[PDB]
Design a protein around this ligand. Structure first.
Ligand code: 8F0
Length: 124
């Protein structure tokens, strides 16, 4: 039931170390990582273990903070916007599969509120 996880290295792809990308790893991701609600989002959804055989029938572009962390550590991104997009894909997937008011949604919303606070100002 589990698909292969998103790639965390791609050589066909050009890489960049920007000040914003370093900050997204050192400050943004690491703060979110320690949040009390971060743990469901620290690795790909394990649909077999959660016995959610429908998850990957619905979610076709999965994303999680473990994948983002590995991408950042591998300089996988060209710019901060690409990384921010991965965060937003992660949150949106949770809002798509689940319903407003669900506990997992409350957790994603708390992480998203903090994410938006931390990315409001990025380095130059
Ligand atoms: C409040 C509560 C209940 C269960 C769990 C289980 C143990 N782990 C887990 C990790 C990530 C996800 C989910 C479950 N959900 C399930 C709907 C619960 C899927 C759909 C989803 O979208 N994500 C992001 C954690 C937190």
């Amino acid at each position: 039931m589990n698909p292969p996880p998103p790639e965390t290295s791609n050589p066909n792809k050009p890489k960049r170390q920007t000040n914003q990308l370093q900050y997204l790893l050192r400050v943004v991701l690491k703060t979110l990582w320690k949040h009390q609600f971060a743990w469901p989002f620290q690795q790909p959804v394990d649909a077999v273990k959660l016995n959610l055989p429908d998850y990957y029938k619905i979610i076709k572009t999965p994303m999680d903070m473990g994948t983002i962390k590995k991408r950042l550590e591998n300089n996988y991104y060209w710019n901060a916007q690409e990384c921010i997009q991965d965060f937003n894909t992660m949150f949106t997937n949770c809002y798509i599969y689940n319903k407003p008011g669900d506990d997992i949604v409350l957790m994603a919303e708390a992480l998203e509120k903090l994410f938006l606070q931390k990315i409001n100002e990025l380095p130059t």
